[PDB]
């Protein structure tokens, strides 16, 4: 036996979009490659926001 707790082992986060939109899935494929094969942290932020739900992607007004 090992004295550990397993209630936080599984991190809860979006690993992929819950959407079935194939156009969103295609540019997720694009930015999954960009995040992996570059050192840019911009690609990593964009990729994780592509996974995000709509309430986590609020609209941005022109103003």
């Amino acid at each position: 036996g090992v004295d550990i707790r397993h209630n936080k082992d599984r991190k809860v986060r979006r690993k992929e979009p819950k959407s079935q939109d194939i156009y969103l899935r295609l540019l997720v494929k694009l930015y999954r490659f960009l995040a992996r094969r570059t050192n840019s942290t911009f690609n990593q932020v964009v990729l994780k926001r592509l996974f995000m739900s709509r309430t986590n992607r609020p609209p941005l007004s022109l103003s």
Partner: protein, 225 residues
């Protein structure tokens, strides 16, 4: 352009080879230096005691600065304070071992978990055999076997520790980077003691196994790994 890049690649491979020879020669000579240093420390303790006994006085050696702690009890029915200190000593499993730098702060933590541990003062041979046979490094949170010096040099090279000899020297003599070298070491997963124990539930000074046995921890180590 085919020949020009061929010259460049061969010259790059040569520069890598000469750097590797230079690194090999360095860790070879560092180990030779450590062999000189270890025997100087061993002979100095003998010489200091000899000159004291010649004068009729006593030579009290320095209190040991390094301990090896083995958890001897299991994970069932442990009090909250003992459980916390064992987690801080990285002993979350029975027969797990770890090196502890000795001072007032660490010793008073060892006294809390005394019924749960057997500890003592490892000698040079115990440190060698623990690192060489059961030495694993915590590399990117993974338990990676220390099969190559490159694993040590990549994570601890910024402290000047680039080989198993440097790691062993930093553990045996406590050194400035004991915390980094020791926390790099994954806690040792020792086997059950071959030949059995006396009594895990009582202290060593009353015929059991718990608590501090000064240099008898080395007998326990030979039987456990």
């Amino acid at each position: 352009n085919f020949a020009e890049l061929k010259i460049k690649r061969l010259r790059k491979k040569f520069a890598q080879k000469m750097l590797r020879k230079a690194r090999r020669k360095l860790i070879y000579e560092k180990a030779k230096h450590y062999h000189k240093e270890y025997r100087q420390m061993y002979r100095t303790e003998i010489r200091m005691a000899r000159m004291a006994r010649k004068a009729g006085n006593f030579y009290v050696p320095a209190e040991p600065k390094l301990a090896f702690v083995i958890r001897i009890r299991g994970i069932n029915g442990v009090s909250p304070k003992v459980r916390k200190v064992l987690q801080l000593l990285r002993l979350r499993q029975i027969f797990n071992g770890t090196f502890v730098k000795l001072n007032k702060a660490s010793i008073n933590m060892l006294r809390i978990v005394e019924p749960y541990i057997a500890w003592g003062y490892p000698n040079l041979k115990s440190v060698n055999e623990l690192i060489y046979k059961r030495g694993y490094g915590k590399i990117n949170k993974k338990r990676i076997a220390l099969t190559d010096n490159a694993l040590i040099a990549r994570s601890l090279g910024k402290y000047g520790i680039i080989c198993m000899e440097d790691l062993i020297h930093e553990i045996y003599t406590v050194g400035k980077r004991f915390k980094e070298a020791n926390n790099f070491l994954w806690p040792f997963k020792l086997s059950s003691p071959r030949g059995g124990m006396k009594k895990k539930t009582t202290h060593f000074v009353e015929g059991g196994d718990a608590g501090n046995r000064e240099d008898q921890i080395n007998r326990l180590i030979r039987r456990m790994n």
